[PDB]
Amino acid sequence: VLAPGASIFRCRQCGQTISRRDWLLPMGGDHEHVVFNPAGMIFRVWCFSLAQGLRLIGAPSGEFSWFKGYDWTIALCGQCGSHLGWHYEGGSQPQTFFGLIKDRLAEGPAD
Ligand SMILES: O=C1CC[C@H](N2C(=O)c3ccccc3C2=O)C(=O)N1
Ligand SMILES: [Zn+2]
């Protein structure tokens, strides 16, 4: 298409470039996974094969992982520090991916 308006995802709080709709990843047959943490917070997580502009904090943990066989690290916006989701590693097909919180991103046109 010409002039697509739903191409890239930016940090909602600051505008840092984070990911792309083309990089959505259907984990378990769906890119969307609705999950809760031990504090009871519900997240609509979109899985992406790739992302940029984040800062991955600390070492991986398997504790409470929403995705079998993966360990996670918190992913902050590398610009403003907003908690955007998690990076998953240590698993299989794929070894790694990102789970980002949908409502913490803004979607819009490319570049
Ligand atoms: O797959 C995941 C990613 C991390 C996530 N997580 C949280 O969001 C959290 C908040 C406070 C204490 C502990 C946790 C934790 O494990 C969680 O529960 N599962
Ligand atoms: Zn940000």
Side-chain angles (χ1 to χ4, degrees), residues 11 16-19 51-55 76-80 84:
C11 176
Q16 174 86 318
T17 322
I18 305 297
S19 193
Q52 59 182 89
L54 299 162
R55 183 163 92 263
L76 305 182
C77 178
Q79 181 163 266
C80 79
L84 297 187

PDB file of all heavy atoms in Angstrom, residues 11 16-19 51-55 76-80 84:
ATOM      1  N   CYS A  11       7.035   4.070  21.453  1.00  0.00           N
ATOM      2  CA  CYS A  11       6.692   4.253  22.871  1.00  0.00           C
ATOM      3  C   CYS A  11       5.581   5.287  22.976  1.00  0.00           C
ATOM      4  O   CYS A  11       5.726   6.415  22.474  1.00  0.00           O
ATOM      5  CB  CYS A  11       7.901   4.646  23.675  1.00  0.00           C
ATOM      6  SG  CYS A  11       7.500   4.986  25.383  1.00  0.00           S
ATOM      7  N   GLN A  16       9.863   7.013  21.111  1.00  0.00           N
ATOM      8  CA  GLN A  16      10.971   6.163  20.700  1.00  0.00           C
ATOM      9  C   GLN A  16      10.456   5.064  19.755  1.00  0.00           C
ATOM     10  O   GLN A  16       9.461   4.435  20.036  1.00  0.00           O
ATOM     11  CB  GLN A  16      11.551   5.499  21.955  1.00  0.00           C
ATOM     12  CG  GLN A  16      12.626   4.462  21.704  1.00  0.00           C
ATOM     13  CD  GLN A  16      14.004   5.046  21.596  1.00  0.00           C
ATOM     14  OE1 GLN A  16      14.200   6.106  20.961  1.00  0.00           O
ATOM     15  NE2 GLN A  16      14.962   4.418  22.256  1.00  0.00           N
ATOM     16  N   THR A  17      11.184   4.835  18.666  1.00  0.00           N
ATOM     17  CA  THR A  17      10.823   3.738  17.768  1.00  0.00           C
ATOM     18  C   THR A  17      11.076   2.394  18.469  1.00  0.00           C
ATOM     19  O   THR A  17      12.158   2.223  18.967  1.00  0.00           O
ATOM     20  CB  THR A  17      11.708   3.805  16.511  1.00  0.00           C
ATOM     21  OG1 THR A  17      11.921   5.224  16.122  1.00  0.00           O
ATOM     22  CG2 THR A  17      11.136   2.943  15.514  1.00  0.00           C
ATOM     23  N   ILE A  18      10.095   1.499  18.476  1.00  0.00           N
ATOM     24  CA  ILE A  18      10.187   0.202  19.178  1.00  0.00           C
ATOM     25  C   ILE A  18      10.025  -0.992  18.247  1.00  0.00           C
ATOM     26  O   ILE A  18      10.830  -1.918  18.327  1.00  0.00           O
ATOM     27  CB  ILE A  18       9.189   0.111  20.326  1.00  0.00           C
ATOM     28  CG1 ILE A  18       9.311   1.240  21.317  1.00  0.00           C
ATOM     29  CG2 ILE A  18       9.312  -1.214  21.047  1.00  0.00           C
ATOM     30  CD1 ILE A  18      10.597   1.327  22.052  1.00  0.00           C
ATOM     31  N   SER A  19       8.972  -1.083  17.448  1.00  0.00           N
ATOM     32  CA  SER A  19       8.835  -2.291  16.621  1.00  0.00           C
ATOM     33  C   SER A  19       7.975  -1.959  15.411  1.00  0.00           C
ATOM     34  O   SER A  19       7.724  -0.800  15.094  1.00  0.00           O
ATOM     35  CB  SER A  19       8.316  -3.463  17.446  1.00  0.00           C
ATOM     36  OG  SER A  19       8.466  -4.702  16.702  1.00  0.00           O
ATOM     37  N   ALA A  51      12.527  -6.133  18.044  1.00  0.00           N
ATOM     38  CA  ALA A  51      12.222  -4.772  18.568  1.00  0.00           C
ATOM     39  C   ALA A  51      13.516  -4.061  18.735  1.00  0.00           C
ATOM     40  O   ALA A  51      14.610  -4.665  18.688  1.00  0.00           O
ATOM     41  CB  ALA A  51      11.492  -4.867  19.885  1.00  0.00           C
ATOM     42  N   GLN A  52      13.442  -2.769  18.843  1.00  0.00           N
ATOM     43  CA  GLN A  52      14.565  -1.872  19.032  1.00  0.00           C
ATOM     44  C   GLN A  52      14.220  -0.809  20.027  1.00  0.00           C
ATOM     45  O   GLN A  52      13.069  -0.695  20.409  1.00  0.00           O
ATOM     46  CB  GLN A  52      14.939  -1.181  17.682  1.00  0.00           C
ATOM     47  CG  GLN A  52      13.783  -0.388  17.083  1.00  0.00           C
ATOM     48  CD  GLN A  52      14.084   0.245  15.750  1.00  0.00           C
ATOM     49  OE1 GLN A  52      13.872  -0.408  14.757  1.00  0.00           O
ATOM     50  NE2 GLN A  52      14.404   1.502  15.735  1.00  0.00           N
ATOM     51  N   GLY A  53      15.186  -0.003  20.423  1.00  0.00           N
ATOM     52  CA  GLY A  53      14.892   1.141  21.241  1.00  0.00           C
ATOM     53  C   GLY A  53      14.602   0.844  22.659  1.00  0.00           C
ATOM     54  O   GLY A  53      14.162   1.754  23.401  1.00  0.00           O
ATOM     55  N   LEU A  54      14.775  -0.389  23.104  1.00  0.00           N
ATOM     56  CA  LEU A  54      14.517  -0.813  24.460  1.00  0.00           C
ATOM     57  C   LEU A  54      15.801  -0.849  25.221  1.00  0.00           C
ATOM     58  O   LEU A  54      16.895  -0.758  24.655  1.00  0.00           O
ATOM     59  CB  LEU A  54      13.861  -2.212  24.482  1.00  0.00           C
ATOM     60  CG  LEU A  54      12.516  -2.249  23.773  1.00  0.00           C
ATOM     61  CD1 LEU A  54      12.152  -3.684  23.434  1.00  0.00           C
ATOM     62  CD2 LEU A  54      11.411  -1.598  24.601  1.00  0.00           C
ATOM     63  N   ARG A  55      15.704  -1.012  26.529  1.00  0.00           N
ATOM     64  CA  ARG A  55      16.817  -1.371  27.406  1.00  0.00           C
ATOM     65  C   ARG A  55      16.375  -2.546  28.196  1.00  0.00           C
ATOM     66  O   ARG A  55      15.365  -2.502  28.901  1.00  0.00           O
ATOM     67  CB  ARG A  55      17.132  -0.210  28.328  1.00  0.00           C
ATOM     68  CG  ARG A  55      18.259  -0.296  29.251  1.00  0.00           C
ATOM     69  CD  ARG A  55      18.694   1.084  29.785  1.00  0.00           C
ATOM     70  NE  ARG A  55      18.039   1.450  31.042  1.00  0.00           N
ATOM     71  CZ  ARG A  55      16.963   2.204  31.272  1.00  0.00           C
ATOM     72  NH1 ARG A  55      16.190   2.861  30.342  1.00  0.00           N
ATOM     73  NH2 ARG A  55      16.617   2.326  32.563  1.00  0.00           N
ATOM     74  N   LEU A  76      12.482  -1.996  29.157  1.00  0.00           N
ATOM     75  CA  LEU A  76      12.071  -0.595  29.309  1.00  0.00           C
ATOM     76  C   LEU A  76      12.268   0.117  28.001  1.00  0.00           C
ATOM     77  O   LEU A  76      13.178  -0.231  27.216  1.00  0.00           O
ATOM     78  CB  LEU A  76      12.885   0.090  30.363  1.00  0.00           C
ATOM     79  CG  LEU A  76      12.894  -0.580  31.741  1.00  0.00           C
ATOM     80  CD1 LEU A  76      13.713   0.280  32.690  1.00  0.00           C
ATOM     81  CD2 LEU A  76      11.485  -0.809  32.284  1.00  0.00           C
ATOM     82  N   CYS A  77      11.492   1.158  27.758  1.00  0.00           N
ATOM     83  CA  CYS A  77      11.855   2.104  26.705  1.00  0.00           C
ATOM     84  C   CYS A  77      13.236   2.650  27.019  1.00  0.00           C
ATOM     85  O   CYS A  77      13.517   3.142  28.134  1.00  0.00           O
ATOM     86  CB  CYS A  77      10.863   3.241  26.706  1.00  0.00           C
ATOM     87  SG  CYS A  77      11.259   4.517  25.462  1.00  0.00           S
ATOM     88  N   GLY A  78      14.148   2.543  26.036  1.00  0.00           N
ATOM     89  CA  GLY A  78      15.494   2.993  26.253  1.00  0.00           C
ATOM     90  C   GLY A  78      15.625   4.494  26.317  1.00  0.00           C
ATOM     91  O   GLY A  78      16.660   4.959  26.784  1.00  0.00           O
ATOM     92  N   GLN A  79      14.625   5.206  25.883  1.00  0.00           N
ATOM     93  CA  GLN A  79      14.641   6.666  25.926  1.00  0.00           C
ATOM     94  C   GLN A  79      14.077   7.166  27.258  1.00  0.00           C
ATOM     95  O   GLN A  79      14.775   7.815  28.007  1.00  0.00           O
ATOM     96  CB  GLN A  79      13.944   7.194  24.671  1.00  0.00           C
ATOM     97  CG  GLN A  79      13.920   8.718  24.592  1.00  0.00           C
ATOM     98  CD  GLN A  79      13.618   9.174  23.167  1.00  0.00           C
ATOM     99  OE1 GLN A  79      14.566   9.428  22.428  1.00  0.00           O
ATOM    100  NE2 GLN A  79      12.371   9.185  22.750  1.00  0.00           N
ATOM    101  N   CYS A  80      12.842   6.788  27.573  1.00  0.00           N
ATOM    102  CA  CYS A  80      12.121   7.402  28.725  1.00  0.00           C
ATOM    103  C   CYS A  80      11.997   6.482  29.928  1.00  0.00           C
ATOM    104  O   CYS A  80      11.577   6.943  30.982  1.00  0.00           O
ATOM    105  CB  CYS A  80      10.780   7.910  28.326  1.00  0.00           C
ATOM    106  SG  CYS A  80       9.484   6.630  28.175  1.00  0.00           S
ATOM    107  N   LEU A  84       7.752  -1.285  28.823  1.00  0.00           N
ATOM    108  CA  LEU A  84       7.064  -1.671  27.627  1.00  0.00           C
ATOM    109  C   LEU A  84       6.777  -3.144  27.470  1.00  0.00           C
ATOM    110  O   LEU A  84       5.939  -3.510  26.697  1.00  0.00           O
ATOM    111  CB  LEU A  84       7.812  -1.176  26.396  1.00  0.00           C
ATOM    112  CG  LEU A  84       7.899   0.357  26.303  1.00  0.00           C
ATOM    113  CD1 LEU A  84       8.513   0.766  24.977  1.00  0.00           C
ATOM    114  CD2 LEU A  84       6.563   1.083  26.489  1.00  0.00           C
TER     115      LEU A  84
END
